[PDB]
Design a protein around this ligand. Structure first.
Ligand SMILES: CC(C)C[C@H](NC(=O)[C@H](CO)NP(=O)(O)CNC(=O)OCc1ccccc1)C(=O)O
Ligand SMILES: [Ca+2]
Ligand SMILES: [Ca+2]
Ligand SMILES: [Ca+2]
Ligand SMILES: [Ca+2]
Ligand SMILES: [Zn+2]
Length: 316
């Protein structure tokens, strides 16, 4: 909408207060004009029609329970935009400052979030399996990263290419969580998953097997559930990424860690220069090796660590 840029205040899903960029024109709208061609947050009103209505508020204060998912979707989309711009020199998901759109209050009791090809969509959860999923910065960044992938490598959402697609979203979701630097970890979705159970999460990158996911290529799933295991086999790549950054010895193979910033540089370059819609795990290894070679040199520790990490997870 046309209006003037304003700054509202509200509370997110986890009860924390934050400022949000809004737009005033009769109402205050969840429209942040400070980033690219805008960040826009919509109310889906418990229905499944998308996007719903651009979020309108009479007083620029967003402290109602109903407001909390919208506050966080809007704010964490801004953090994710900032990460891609400041760290990777990428302007929004398309590299040309496309408007970022999210809808909250999607459906009833909806235990998921997704990118629908055009926008982010967040369920509220059923209150037992999840609370509203936009409360997780890693979840928000996971979703926006699907848009980045779709505009760049274009990894098809099934089998190995789809597991790479998923791992890219978990990797960058985690790197955005570390960028914001509030309780960062190598777990996925811990802030919004199972409010009645402490210490769990959807997935673990440091130890995928904790939540049943493979941590070695010999344990990959090749059935048909979950688009050929895209959220399952992602564990093999998530583990490799964790090892590149943090190091460790896994199935007897030792990896010297090189840190998160270099992990992100290597995988961002692989995603945007070398991967294609059909890349498999072996081709990801080759893309990561080439990316590290470009950035750090063929004799570098960084290249050596990429090779050891993929060796450790059984990907040649
Ligand atoms: C329990 C559930 C949340 C775990 C899992 N979800 C996640 O792990 C994440 C949560 O951030 N959501 P996502 O991977 O984006 C889906 C698919 C699709 C949708 C629209 C168009 C084209 C294709 C799943 O979907 O199984
Ligand atoms: Ca209000
Ligand atoms: Ca965390
Ligand atoms: Ca996390
Ligand atoms: Ca929990
Ligand atoms: Zn995903």
């Amino acid at each position: 909408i046309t209006g003037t840029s304003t700054v509202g205040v509200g509370r997110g899903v986890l009860g924390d207060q934050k400022n949000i960029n809004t737009t005033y024109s009769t109402y205050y709208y969840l429209q942040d004009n400070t980033r690219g061609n805008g960040i826009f947050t919509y109310d889906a009103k418990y229905r499944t029609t998308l996007p719903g209505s651009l979020w309108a508020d009479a007083d620029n204060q967003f402290f109602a329970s109903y407001d909390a998912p919208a506050v966080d979707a809007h704010y964490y989309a801004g953090v994710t935009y900032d990460y891609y711009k400041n760290v990777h020199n990428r302007l929004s998901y398309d590299g040309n400052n496309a408007a970022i759109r999210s809808s909250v209050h999607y459906s009833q009791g909806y235990n998921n979030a997704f990118w629908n090809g055009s926008q982010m969509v967040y369920g509220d959860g059923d209150g037992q399996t999840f609370i509203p999923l936009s409360g997780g910065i890693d979840v928000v960044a996971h979703e926006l990263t699907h848009a980045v992938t779709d505009y760049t490598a274009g990894l098809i959402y099934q089998n190995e290419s789809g597991a790479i697609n998923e791992a890219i979203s978990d990797i960058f979701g985690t790197l955005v969580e570390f960028y914001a630097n509030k309780n960062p970890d190598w777990e996925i979705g811990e802030d919004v998953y199972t409010p009645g159970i402490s210490g769990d999460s959807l997935r673990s990158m440091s130890d995928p097997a904790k939540y049943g996911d493979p941590d070695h290529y010999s344990k990959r799933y090749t059935g048909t559930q979950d688009n050929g295991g895209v959220h399952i086999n992602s564990g093999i790549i998530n583990k490799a990424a964790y090892l590149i950054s943090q190091g460790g010895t896994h199935y007897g193979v030792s990896v010297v860690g090189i840190g998160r910033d270099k992990l992100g540089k290597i995988f961002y370059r692989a995603l945007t220069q070398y991967l294609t819609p059909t890349s498999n795990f072996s081709q990801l290894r080759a893309a990561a090796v080439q990316s590290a070679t470009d950035l750090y040199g063929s004799t570098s520790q960084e290249v050596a660590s990429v090779k050891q990490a993929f060796d450790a997870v059984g990907v040649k």
